[PDB]
Amino acid sequence: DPQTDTIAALIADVAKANQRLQDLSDEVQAEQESVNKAMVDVETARDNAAAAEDDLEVSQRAVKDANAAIAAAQHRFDTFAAATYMNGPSVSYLSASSPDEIIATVTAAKTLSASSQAVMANLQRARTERVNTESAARLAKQKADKAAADAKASQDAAVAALTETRRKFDEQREEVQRLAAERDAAQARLQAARLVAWSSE
């Protein structure tokens, strides 16, 4: 019969539509898991980038300190020399200096310079070590931000895939309801026809 084969086609169409809704549902769950996973990776990468920013800030502060140490030492030595000179035989000390006094004085001054240079060289070396660590930390930062940025991208993709799959699910759900109602109404019609057709036989 031409009827009973349109009912059969509808049984099949409703079955297909439901199977596809289910398959889209399973896809949704997998996208969901990938988005949740992607969000954990954003978080851990954000924390690593935060720790890298802290390292960098700490390293820059050590450099500022090293610089301050150099400025302070230079000033201490400059003050030492200036105080010695002001209270010395060229200024405040008015009495005669023998040849030996003069020689002691320049040798003291030469000694002070040599000592000052040795201390400053050490401070300059230390400063250099701080500038290096800052460079190291600045790069470890750049890597960490990059890594955080890449995690955000992965998340954004996973969010887009999931949103699209839910878009498909929603439309498939409408199709299912439509085919269901239509399959219902076809059987109803067929039944109705059978009752009428029997009522007169």
Side-chain angles (χ1 to χ4, degrees), residues 2-201:
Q3 295 218 342
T4 74
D5 269 2
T6 70
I7 282 127
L10 276 160
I11 286 155
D13 294 318
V14 161
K16 281 177 205 290
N18 262 128
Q19 179 57 46
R20 203 214 173 199
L21 189 63
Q22 177 68 45
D23 289 335
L24 279 168
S25 179
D26 298 339
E27 187 181 11
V28 166
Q29 302 197 12
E31 323 273 13
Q32 178 185 22
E33 300 172 14
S34 279
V35 168
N36 293 332
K37 169 77 183 177
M39 289 183 58
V40 168
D41 298 330
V42 161
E43 202 58 35
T44 57
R46 281 179 65 94
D47 293 346
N48 294 339
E53 174 60 24
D54 264 297
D55 289 8
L56 169 58
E57 293 175 350
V58 161
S59 72
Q60 291 171 320
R61 190 167 316 139
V63 164
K64 180 175 277 180
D65 287 12
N67 282 334
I70 288 157
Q74 180 60 267
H75 169 88
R76 156 170 104 243
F77 288 127
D78 285 355
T79 292
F80 198 139
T84 302
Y85 176 76
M86 293 306 276
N87 298 282
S90 308
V91 186
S92 292
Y93 187 76
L94 307 176
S95 302
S97 286
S98 66
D100 290 341
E101 279 155 280
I102 291 165
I103 301 172
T105 321
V106 321
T107 298
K110 285 182 180 304
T111 300
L112 181 53
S113 269
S115 293
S116 166
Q117 261 182 12
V119 175
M120 301 297 288
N122 183 59
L123 287 170
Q124 287 291 345
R125 168 204 60 89
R127 174 190 175 279
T128 297
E129 252 164 65
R130 300 293 177 185
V131 165
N132 294 343
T133 304
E134 178 186 43
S135 289
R138 184 177 304 283
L139 254 170
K141 175 202 169 52
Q142 279 164 356
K143 299 199 182 193
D145 285 352
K146 171 225 58 203
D150 293 348
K152 182 54 164 59
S154 307
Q155 177 184 284
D156 287 333
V159 168
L162 168 63
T163 311
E164 165 71 8
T165 305
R166 170 63 186 255
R167 190 197 68 76
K168 266 138 81 187
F169 177 88
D170 282 338
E171 83 177 45
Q172 182 66 52
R173 191 175 53 209
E174 279 153 32
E175 189 66 8
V176 151
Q177 294 165 307
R178 207 194 330 285
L179 287 157
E182 185 182 352
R183 183 211 47 207
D184 285 8
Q187 313 235 19
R189 283 196 310 271
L190 167 68
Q191 244 198 211
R194 292 207 171 163
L195 240 204
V196 145
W198 175 64
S199 288
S200 339
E201 299 196 353

